[PDB]
Amino acid sequence: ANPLYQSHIISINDLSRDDLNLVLATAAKLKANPQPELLKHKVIASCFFEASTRTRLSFQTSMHRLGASVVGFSDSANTSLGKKGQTLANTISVISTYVDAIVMRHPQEGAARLATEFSGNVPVLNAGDGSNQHPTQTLLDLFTIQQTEGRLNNLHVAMVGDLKYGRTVHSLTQALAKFDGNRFYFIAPDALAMPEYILDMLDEKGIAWSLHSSIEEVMTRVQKERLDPSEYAXVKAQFLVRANSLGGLHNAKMNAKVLHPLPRVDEIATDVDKTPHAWYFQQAGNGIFARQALLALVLNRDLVL
Amino acid sequence: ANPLYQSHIISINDLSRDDLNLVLATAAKLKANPQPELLKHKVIASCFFEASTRTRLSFQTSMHRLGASVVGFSDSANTSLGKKGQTLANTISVISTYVDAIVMRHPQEGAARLATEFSGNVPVLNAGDGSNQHPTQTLLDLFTIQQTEGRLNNLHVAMVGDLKYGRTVHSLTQALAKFDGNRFYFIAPDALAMPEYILDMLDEKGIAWSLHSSIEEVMTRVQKERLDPSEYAXVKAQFLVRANSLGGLHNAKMNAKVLHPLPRVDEIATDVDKTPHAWYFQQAGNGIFARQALLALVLNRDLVL
Amino acid sequence: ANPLYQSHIISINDLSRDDLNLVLATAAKLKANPQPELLKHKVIASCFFEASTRTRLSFQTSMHRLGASVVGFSDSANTSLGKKGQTLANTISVISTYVDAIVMRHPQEGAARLATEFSGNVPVLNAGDGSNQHPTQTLLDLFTIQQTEGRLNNLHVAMVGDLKYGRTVHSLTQALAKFDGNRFYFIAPDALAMPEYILDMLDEKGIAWSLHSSIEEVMTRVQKERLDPSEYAXVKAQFLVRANSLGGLHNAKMNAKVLHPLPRVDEIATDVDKTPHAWYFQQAGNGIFARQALLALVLNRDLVL
Amino acid sequence: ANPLYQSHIISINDLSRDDLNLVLATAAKLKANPQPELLKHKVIASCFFEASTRTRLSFQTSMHRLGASVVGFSDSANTSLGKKGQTLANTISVISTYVDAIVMRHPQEGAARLATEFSGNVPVLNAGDGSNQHPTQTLLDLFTIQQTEGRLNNLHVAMVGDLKYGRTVHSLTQALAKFDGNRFYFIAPDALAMPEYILDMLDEKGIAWSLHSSIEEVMTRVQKERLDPSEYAXVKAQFLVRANSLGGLHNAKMNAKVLHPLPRVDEIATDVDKTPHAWYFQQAGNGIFARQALLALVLNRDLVL
Amino acid sequence: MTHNDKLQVAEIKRGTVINHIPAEIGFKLLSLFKLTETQDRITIGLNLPSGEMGRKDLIKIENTFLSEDEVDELALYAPQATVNRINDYEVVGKSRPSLPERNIDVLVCPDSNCISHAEPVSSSFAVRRADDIALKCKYCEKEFSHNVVLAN
Amino acid sequence: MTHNDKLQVAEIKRGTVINHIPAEIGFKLLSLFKLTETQDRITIGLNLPSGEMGRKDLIKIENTFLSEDEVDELALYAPQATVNRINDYEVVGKSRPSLPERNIDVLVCPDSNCISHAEPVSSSFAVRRADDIALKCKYCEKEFSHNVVLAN
Ligand SMILES: [Zn+2]
Ligand SMILES: [Zn+2]
């Protein structure tokens, strides 16, 4: 009776305002009002086609705070199955069989979809296709934006990183975008530039934005921060002007905050840690809520709203 | 009060009609009538001396639909213990200690037995000794034969594969054999021939059979199919007349079905998938029932028959 | 002016009586009359597409007793090249370029041939295609038969082993066969049976033979022995009647000898070592002569006959 | 008495017209007039701090056509030394000791230089520092340009590839640049763009150039081609417009030629192979000459000009 | 009948008589699609056409009860073609292969990772243009262009 | 000319007019071999034949200056076929696809290891029979049978 029922979740693109405003709000309370046993008698599948752990460790914990089960595996090593023969779609069709649901992560980029098709009525959650989509991340992100600035409307956003191979600013953006008129800032070093497609779409739509290579002014008329990471790929003398580092002297502050779907390294400084705008963490602890919401939506038929 | 109590299960040979007709029927309902909590307060051991996963993933799921616990590990890598010193029988004697039961799998071929001896009153389930026995498989197989053709009596069986190193047609056969007068067919390429011992025993007994290298006629007077796998070992130019492949044009059908303790690869065709006689899967989903039956037999004292 | 010049050697099949009687006799003296510098100013390629070492260590040593050079590599690890892109036929075409010749070994089974095509005028020696051909071995074998029994004519041969996947009795046989009327014995355990093609050919031709599972009588009317190896593949409870083991009490001897392109393990006993019919070794030391012969044939234009 | 004596070679930058016109011409004959024994009594070091093989296999072969020796190793595995303690500069200082010279390759990027300092009078050749310099390559390249178009003066060059991380167009360019007025073309996909430093230098100097994303016209007023490679790093959906592929229909030819310090994969087509402008190979076979020249310059005092 | 036409079909009896659509890319179609795995007889050649000579009707292709878009589908490889009818009294009104929006099994995510290419799929790509033709890849949500795809 | 024949060719001008050889395995041939990568026009259909009706000549195939065995080559997939000539005054004397002994690029060592299948080859297999047809594989000196090969 719930919009979400037996629907497989897999790509943020593929989801509707509403929907967001829902997991968004089923999790808000869940957060204020937990329920272990919503799920008892359930078992789930914590398939780690590509070991991942931060994501897994939180998925899971999720299953169990709702009450429930697991059976899963992380791979690349001492994990088996089919290989030099079998199909990730034989794995599933059997798996499909006993399970009640499937978070599952992978290297390739169809899997959740590829697995939809073969797994009849057992919803799949996508922790990752590959370099393609992570709905859990961005809704995880999206909320958190929400409990903070207090709305996903009339914002001052900015995401300073490697917006190029950036897996999550790509989602974030287009979810943060469905909602409206908010201007985005893209402090990217012409190489971790912003792809010319997620734009024509900002443009595409009716929305706005600007460019800068500072963390500076862009920063005072700014509300939540996504610093991605920066790494390999580029030379190792390509970590030349690594100046897009968040650290401590900003004061010309506001009452915004900073985020980063970890894991930080250089991006940002212990020094900061401490002081407001910090959260990268809360940002994390808030995925345990963002997920749950789903899974109980995903698997229940109705709610205690 | 139950025949099965505190008895360790480990080899199909080593089990009695009755017994089969029991797990066979305790699982039939369990299937029609589940019970999570038959087992609560239980923890079990999911020992994967030899990582295996399809088997593990289902064992386990089993523990939990009955309600219960786990603690286990899959190995060949980042798993520890004793090594260049300790005994799989030191592992056990301690394990033995906290657990309530032990599924456990291995490379060598005594283990479950070897472990019986050292594990005083904590039953061991054998997911595998080695190339020796897998009771769970064949009873898993046996049933499934049952819910299908509707009896394990007066059948038309056939197992086309690599009946030589075939781990499961070796069990199957001798269980399917305890019951009676049924004729078996062995479409094997003189090399994956049928060992001269499981026969003298067909013969040994009072039973029958025939030989063919077709999938053809053998097939019309046929009821359930075991296609094994076919692989390595033999040359790679030894996969010359790989003609014992199940695929699609059979029509000269019946209302039988096809099975394969996966995982398929070449053996059989997507094309088939679809259409009846298919099941390889259901065959699988039915192991979650076949196991459970045991474990609650194994560990309870009585029943709600 | 030499039959052998710039011809690539690769498969025993693909060679003519003559030819055999040649490397056969160029090596006989070479053996009695060495020449370092026949080759000076030469470099060669000791390509070990599949590390192999006994074969490599002797190839090589060969290059240098003739005087000369090397450049090569053994692989499966810390060796490079092209991979997830390049062609064993790009490797060669460059290699081809500086070298003067190429011994080269491999996993696949065209390579020497596949490499012929791309390597214009730089002869390739095949130390192995795969499970296909090893000319060096069998001519190595063939000779040695010769310096012994004193001819490759009017013999009593026998090869007790795993004549099935046996790489060398397959060559041996058909070379030992080109010559004439000699009767062969095949003490093979119906599973390491003799393939039905190298036979129809014995038959095919005009030649003879018999079968036995003894080492016994077959043995008194017997002249040179090829015991192959016996291993893996078959069960490990498949090393059941491993009775085809050569050991020591034979006395009902003759003045024959025993051979084995190593490496022995169980096949044969230290005990033997000692006493005549032994040689497995000399058999080896004689490959350093068998090769050389080639390479100088292969690369010179004429001879000091 | 030779400019080159006891000088360590390591970076093309760090070398003078003259010098180029020298190895350039000592190798031209060497090529027309070989000398094994120029070097006898020599041993050299073929240090493969970073296994590399195409480069090694040719270096080496070099040592020996000049007559000489080797002792070396390829690494990343079963190679030893110091580790969790010792210095590539302890390796050297000892090595230094017995050797007569050192080709050596590495991951890091000082090594040859770092090793100069510690290796007193034993010249080092650099097969690679890292992502920094490969003099052997580019002089190897440079010549070859020469025996072809017949001069390194008044050319039509073009290098279509991944001029960004391109290791060799970076050298090539600046050597091909020392000489004069020649115009260069850079068919690079704005991402494998041309770094803004090797330019300001074209500009810096007095020289010219243009840009295009075709292989087309740029191509008719064109004389030697450097296609680099294209790979990893960028997405795998980043191999989107891989249109900078050299293949076969060019006819609107000339009598130029195509080069590529291998190893090709996609860059260019078998189809081409064949027909003129091909050479990628000769380009290779010509490194055996380019090196030698050095080493005998490097180590002799005078010449037979 | 030594090669030609005799487009007698229309229900219980059919024909297909592809005749070089554009040129030497109608063979394609053939595999590009079934239509040879099928009873009815077939007819082709190469018009090496300019179209028609004296009076040229003003159309070509095949005629045989494809579907509706059993086409629309060619929209991509022979947009310039045309189906069926009859010369005396007949039906196949103004029908041109006109973009489908979702090619089906013909093609191939050039992406190297799509699971597509690893298992039991379907090529399903979706089409949008204004640009120069866009094709997405339910599988690996990525966008390539009629080009580079068309090939593979 | 609404589909048919008009086997006007024979030198500077040619045709090819494969007409269902055996059936639904003449498409094959088509790719099975070039002959579509080529100027001259082509003609086919499906004779759904019994051969011929009233008086049937007693032959079929293609006509167009293949070579000699541009065939002999089909010896394997349509042994029962036949080439060219002319109806009034003509030449193509008793010529039947008759085993070649070495198929060339069509096929595939089923062997999993042949280098064949790993690089820039050629399918070259050699043919001997008395048995039921034998094919070797200069590459991986192994012998399979017209069967299992023919497929792949
Ligand atoms: Zn895709
Ligand atoms: Zn082959």
Q: From the list E115, E120, E141, which residue is nearest A111 (CB)?
A: E115
Question: In 3D, which of D106, D13, D170 has the Cα closest to residue D114?
Answer: D106
> Would you say the C-alpha torsion B232, B236, B242, B248 has a positive or negative sign?
positive
On whether both F95 and F37 belong to a single domain, the answer is yes
On whether both E55 and E89 belong to a single domain, the answer is yes
On whether both F73 and F138 belong to a single domain, the answer is no
Cα distance between residue C121 and residue C8, in whole Å: 9
B72-74/B102-104 β-pairing? unpaired
Cβ-based neighbours of A37, under 8 Å, separated by 6 or more: A67
The phi and psi torsions of B53 (rounded to 5 degrees) equal: 60, -45
Annotated active-site residue A105? The verdict is yes
Residues lying with their CB under 5 A of ligand 2, a single-atom ion:
F 109, 111, 114, 116, 137, 139-140
The answer to whether A and C touch (≥3 CB pairs < 8 Å) is no
A102-104/A45-48 β-pairing? parallel
Ramachandran assignment for A143, one of left (phi > 0), alpha (psi -120 to 50 degrees), beta (any other): alpha
Q: For residue B17, give the 3-state DSSP assignment.
A: helix
On whether both E3 and E63 belong to a single domain, the answer is yes
On whether both F14 and F67 belong to a single domain, the answer is yes
> How is residue D215 written in tokens?
């292989």
Q: Is E43 in contact with F45 (Cβ distance < 8 A)?
A: yes
> How is residue B124 written in tokens?
């061991």
Which one of A46, A75, A97, A114 would you mutate to disrupt binding with B, by most B Cβ within 10 Å of its Cβ? Answer: A97
Helix (H) or strand (E) holding C279, with range, is strand C277-279
With vertex at residue A40, the alpha carbon angle to CA B292 and CA B56, rounded to the nearest 5 degrees, is 35
Cα distance between residue A147 and residue A151, in whole Å: 8
Instruction: Return the residues preceding each gap in chain E, C–N over 2.5 A, or none.
Output: none
* Cα diameter, chain C: 60
Q: Cite the beta strand spans of chain E per DSSP E.
A: 3-4, 127-128, 134-135
CB C225 within 8 Å of CB C264: no
Cα distance between residue F95 and residue F84, in whole Å: 9
Question: In 3D, which of A70, A74, A52, A48 has the Cα closest to residue A61?
Answer: A70
CB A61 within 8 Å of CB B56: no
CATH number (domain holding residue E46): 3.30.70.140
Q: Which residues of D are catalytic?
A: 54-55, 84, 105, 134
* Cα diameter, chain A: 60
Cα distance between residue C62 and residue C54, in whole Å: 12
Question: In 3D, which of D155, D160, D162 has the Cα closest to residue D187?
Answer: D160
CB C232 within 8 Å of CB B131: no
Amino acid at A221: R
Residues tagged in the binding site annotation of C for carbamoyl phosphate: 54-55, 105, 134, 137, 262-263
> How is residue F32 written in tokens?
């099975």
Considering just the CA atoms, what is the radius of gyration of chain A in Å?
20
Find, in chain B, the residue whose alpha carbon is nearest to that of C190.
B191
DSSP state of A103: E
Resolution in A: 3.0
Cα distance between residue C50 and residue C44, in whole Å: 17
Q: Which residue has the tokens 């060969």?
A: C62
DSSP state of B124: B
On whether both F82 and F124 belong to a single domain, the answer is no
Cα distance between residue A100 and residue A122, in whole Å: 6
On whether both F82 and F107 belong to a single domain, the answer is no
Question: CA neighbours within 13 Å on the CB side: how many for A35?
Answer: 20
Q: For residue B145, give the 3-state DSSP assignment.
A: helix
On whether both E77 and E7 belong to a single domain, the answer is yes
CB A283 within 8 Å of CB A260: yes
CB D134 within 8 Å of CB D112: no
CB C246 within 8 Å of CB C226: no
Q: Which residue has the tokens 């391109």?
A: D166
CB A219 within 8 Å of CB A271: no
- Measure the CA dihedral C67/C71/C74/C80, to 10°: 180
Burial A132-156 (b: 16+ CB within 10 A, else e): bbbbbbbbbbbbbbbebbeebeebb
A114 contact residues in E (CB cutoff 8 A): 115-116, 118-119, 121, 139
On whether both E93 and E115 belong to a single domain, the answer is no
Q: Is A233 in contact with D233 (Cβ distance < 8 A)?
A: yes
Which ligand does the CA of A109 lie closest to? Answer: 1
On whether both E130 and E56 belong to a single domain, the answer is no
D45-48/D102-104 β-pairing? parallel
CB D131 within 8 Å of CB D165: yes
Helix (H) or strand (E) holding C48, with range, is strand C45-48
Q: Which residues pair with B258 in a beta bridge?
A: B225, B279
Assess B265–F contact: CB distance below 8 Å, yes or no.
no
Is the omega angle on the peptide bond into residue B263 within 30 degrees of 0, that is, cis? yes
F148 contact residues in B (CB cutoff 8 A): 240-243
On whether both F54 and F108 belong to a single domain, the answer is no
Considering just the CA atoms, what is the radius of gyration of chain C in Å?
20
DSSP state of F75: G
Q: Cite the beta strand spans of chain A per DSSP E.
A: 45-48, 72-74, 102-104, 157-159, 184-185, 209-210, 224-226, 257-259, 277-279
Domains (range + CATH), chain C? 1-133+287-305 (3.40.50.1370), 134-286 (3.40.50.1370)
Cα distance between residue D15 and residue D11, in whole Å: 7
CA distance F128 to chain B (A): 18
The answer to whether B and D touch (≥3 CB pairs < 8 Å) is no
Assess B237–C contact: CB distance below 8 Å, yes or no.
yes
The structure's method of determination equals X-ray
Task: For chain D, give the secondary structure using H, E and C.
Answer: CCCCCCCCCCCCCCCCHHHHHHHHHHHHHHCCCCCCCCCCCCCCEEEECCCCCHHHHHHHHHHHHCCCCCCEEECCCCCCCCCCCCCCCCHHHHHHHHCCCEEEECCCCCHHHHHHHHCCCCCECCCECCCCCCHHHHHHHHHHHHHHHCCCCCCCEEECCCCCCCCCHHHHHHHHHHCCCCCEECCCCCCCCCCCHHHHHHHHHCCCEECCCCCCCCCCCCCEEECCCCCCCCCCCCCCCCCCCCCCCCCCCCCCEEECCCCCCCCCCCCCCCCCEEECCHHHHCHHHHHHHHHHHHHCCCCCC
Quote the number of domains for chain F: 2
Q: How many CB atoms lie within 10 A of CB E30?
A: 18
Considering just the CA atoms, what is the radius of gyration of chain F in Å?
17
CA distance between the termini of chain F:
39
Cα distance between residue E4 and residue E137, in whole Å: 41
Helices D111-118 and D91-98 pack at an angle, to 10 degrees, of: 60
Q: Which residues pair with D277 in a beta bridge?
A: D257
> How is residue A286 written in tokens?
């808030």
On whether both E149 and E82 belong to a single domain, the answer is no
Question: In 3D, which of C192, C230, C202, C209 has the Cα closest to residue C158?
Answer: C209
* Helix, strand, coil percent content, chain B, rounded in steps of 5: 30, 10, 60
Cα A94 from chain centre: 28
Q: Kindly report each contact of residues D200-205 with a partner whose C-beta sits within 8 Å and lies 24 or more positions away, as own/partner.
A: D201/D174, D201/D177, D202/D173, D202/D177, D205/D177
CA distance F142 to chain C (A): 8
Cα distance between residue D274 and residue C14, in whole Å: 29
Cα distance between residue A77 and residue D254, in whole Å: 54
DSSP state of F4: E
Question: In 3D, which of B133, D237, E29 has the Cα closest to residue A108?
Answer: D237
Cα distance between residue D116 and residue D232, in whole Å: 33
Q: What is the DSSP code string of C182-247? A: --EE----TTS---SHHHHHHHHHT--EE--S-SSTTSSS--EEE-----TTS-SSS-SS------
**Which of E100, E120, E139 finishes a domain?**
E100
Q: Which residue has the tokens 């119906």?
A: C190
CA distance B241 to chain F (A): 7
Cα D1 from chain centre: 26
The phi and psi torsions of D103 (rounded to 5 degrees) equal: -50, 150
Q: For residue A13, give the 3-state DSSP assignment.
A: coil
- Provide the chain F residues 71-130 that lie in CB contact (below 8 A) with chain B: 110-113
Q: For residue F38, give the 3-state DSSP assignment.
A: coil
Q: Is F144 in contact with B240 (Cβ distance < 8 A)?
A: yes
Which ligand does the CA of F107 lie closest to? Answer: 2
Cβ-based neighbours of C48, under 8 Å, separated by 6 or more: C56, C72, C73, C74, C75, C79, C104, C105, C127
Assess F144–B contact: CB distance below 8 Å, yes or no.
yes
Domain that holds residue E87: 1-100
Burial C198-228 (b: 16+ CB within 10 A, else e): beeebeeeeeeeeeeeebeebbeebbbbbbb
CATH number (domain holding residue E109): 2.30.30.20
Cβ-based neighbours of B188, under 8 Å, separated by 6 or more: B160, B161, B162, B163, B164, B194, B211, B213, B244
- Provide the chain E residues 7-46 that lie in CB contact (below 8 A) with chain F: 7, 17, 19-20, 24, 27, 30-31, 36-37, 39-46
- Measure the CA dihedral D79/D82/D84/D88, to 10°: -100
Q: What is the DSSP code string of A174-211? A: HHHHHS----EE----TTS---SHHHHHHHHHT--EE-
Cα distance between residue C125 and residue C101, in whole Å: 8
CB C30 within 8 Å of CB C293: yes
Give the Å distance between the CA of E120 and the centre of ligand 1: 14
B209-210/B277-279 β-pairing? unpaired
